[PDB]
Swiss-Prot record, chains A, B:
Keywords: Adaptive immunity, Cell membrane, Chromosomal rearrangement, Disulfide bond, Glycoprotein, Immunity, Immunoglobulin, Immunoglobulin domain, Membrane, Secreted, Transmembrane, Transmembrane helix
Protein name in UniProt: Immunoglobulin heavy constant gamma 1
Function: Constant region of immunoglobulin heavy chains. Immunoglobulins, also known as antibodies, are membrane-bound or secreted glycoproteins produced by B lymphocytes. In the recognition phase of humoral immunity, the membrane-bound immunoglobulins serve as receptors which, upon binding of a specific antigen, trigger the clonal expansion and differentiation of B lymphocytes into immunoglobulins-secreting plasma cells. Secreted immunoglobulins mediate the effector phase of humoral immunity, which results in the elimination of bound antigens.
Keyword Transmembrane helix: yes
Subunit composition and interactions: Immunoglobulins are composed of two identical heavy chains and two identical light chains; disulfide-linked. Interacts with FCGR1A; this interaction mediates IgG effector functions on monocytes. Interacts with FCGR2A and FCGR3A.
GO function term, MF aspect, one: Fc-gamma receptor I complex binding
One cellular component (GO) term of this entry: immunoglobulin complex, circulating
Region (CH2): 1-104
Disease affiliated with this protein: Multiple myeloma: A malignant tumor of plasma cells usually arising in the bone marrow and characterized by diffuse involvement of the skeletal system, hyperglobulinemia, Bence-Jones proteinuria and anemia. Complications of multiple myeloma are bone pain, hypercalcemia, renal failure and spinal cord compression. The aberrant antibodies that are produced lead to impaired humoral immunity and patients have a high prevalence of infection. Amyloidosis may develop in some patients.
Length: 208, 208
């Protein structure tokens, strides 16, 4: 019947002390027949009571969806604590358990390189600015572009890819009008990751 | 009872005339009580009988696994014809129908750009050669590297990523010994895609 999906905090939230990371427990296919759901949360086995469950709400299919959110401490998530969400419902003979933690494995520092557009690309009115981020472990990561403190609209980032040494890599393509590039504007790829010092680094790229 | 799996040809196979693309119809779980299986092939609903089907091989889970291979015409697959493999078994109330055809959508031509390693990366013994392939549709594509006409296989390629204008892009990373890069060896990124002229193009990258 009702299924449960447990989601981790956003990388950004866990890596910036100013932000609040939370684990999210989503119960779907809750039926009108038995629409009561109780959540029990556990951090490394020990129960906790600061979860806020949202009021259940109807779906376009006539099931109910119901979500419980548990704020987590940056250090706890980064230190590898296990978060367990226990879901009990009258239609469930025995509760459903999902437990989640950060990716296991030795953390590896990302190397961040910026690559300008190929010469060939200057025959267009738009050009490709490239951020190559490689050698990192946990795949969990945030990569963003900006120019003079302002975030850039047109960019897309590949999913992380398992490289041969077992680290991950990825690329982010930033698209700007050629004039912006030829004007000598400075663009910046920002990267946030746990094995980075102060969880953050940025590399610049402009026309020299 | 018996299950049927229909497999598309490899992009690279459909794309190079000197290669042989084929659609593969795998039937698993055929009982020893109802072993006789017959294949009927239909291109755009028109039956064909040039399928080489291998004699049934016995597994370890008591069932057999028969394979039928249809060598398809390059042009055919690429013109979007529909390959219907119809397997008959006596343990079936009705003969299963599995059909397949190449992805639909307006074909778009990939732009291919080679990008040398950031200067920052020359502090390493290994460097990263980057191929940017963008603006293609069908996300079906083959990307490969070589040097001196010989394949260079220490590379990893990202999945196609849906870009903001509806087409796909990707990146291929080729890792070589810095010493090879600085002796000025020429590496080449070969792309194969249906929307390319002659279904092939290549860009080279060497020390500048
Ligand atoms: C009635 O409707 C509801 C609402 O659904 C909505 O219906 C209409 C309107 C359509 O628009 C739907 O697309 C729309 O969602 C239905 O509820 C849905 O139920 C399905 C399953 O039936 C769920 O699918 C799961 O999706 C998760 C990931 O979901 C995230 O991303 C989705 C899109 O990518 C997004 O839609 C979700 O909102 C969710 O988004 C995340 O949410 C959190 C919290 O807000 C947020 O922090 C994130 O930022 C956000 N992220 C993203 C990407 O947006 C997917 O992971 C599930 O896959 C698991 O299960 C599969 C088998 O069941 C299996 O193939 C996968 O491998 C995986 O299995 C797990 O695997 C791991 C390891 O691999 C293992 O450890 C686990 O044990 C294992 N779990 C198993 C096997 O159970 C899965 O595909 C939808 O999320 C859900 N939609 C919503 C919005 O709630 C409902 O089904 C409908 N009722 C009926 C009967 O049809
Ligand atoms: C008895 O044994 C046989 C085989 O023996 C085997 O060997 C023993 C010793 C064990 O080690 C076992 O490995 C195994 O028992 C069993 O037969 C198997 O049956 C399973 C299903 O139970 C099949 O799984 C399917 O796999 C396909 C993809 O298959 C390719 O990749 C596999 C790895 O993923 C690989 O193992 C296969 O060999 C195969 O390899 C490809 O072969 C082609 C042929 O030329 C070649 O071109 C390719 O290059 C090559 N690829 C490689 C090597 O990379 C997978 O696609 C199927 O997934 C679909 O179906 C699933 C349900 O089964 C479903 O969960 C998925 O979502 C997916 O569903 C699809 O959904 C979409 C959307 O609707 C739709 O487009 C699809 O049509 C739909 N498919 C549906 C609905 O059918 C699937 O998982 C195995 O291939 C098969 N093994 C072999 C080798 O034939 C048998 O089950 C055993 N009987 C028992 C248990 O009693």
């Amino acid at each position: 019947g009702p299924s449960v999906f447990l989601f981790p905090p956003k990388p950004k939230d866990t890596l910036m002390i100013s932000r609040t990371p939370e684990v999210t427990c989503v119960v779907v296919d809750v039926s009108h027949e038995d629409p009561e759901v109780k959540f029990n949360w556990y951090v490394d086995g020990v129960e906790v009571h600061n979860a806020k469950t949202k009021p259940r709400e109807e779906q376009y299919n006539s099931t109910y969806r119901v979500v419980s959110v548990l704020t987590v401490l940056h250090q706890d998530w980064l230190n590898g604590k296990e978060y367990k969400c226990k879901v009990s419902n009258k239609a469930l003979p025995a509760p459903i358990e999902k437990t989640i933690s950060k990716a296991k494995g030795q953390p590896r520092e990302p190397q961040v390189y910026t690559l300008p557009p190929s010469r060939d690309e200057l025959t267009k009115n738009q050009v490709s600015l490239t951020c190559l981020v490689k050698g990192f472990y946990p795949s969990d990561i945030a990569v963003e572009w900006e120019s003079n403190g302002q975030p850039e609209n047109n960019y897309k980032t590949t999913p992380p890819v398992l490289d041969s040494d077992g680290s991950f890599f990825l690329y982010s393509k930033l698209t700007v009008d050629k004039s912006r590039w030829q004007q000598g504007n400075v663009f910046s790829c920002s990267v946030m990751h746990e094995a980075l010092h102060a969880h953050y680094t940025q590399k610049s790229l402009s026309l020299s």
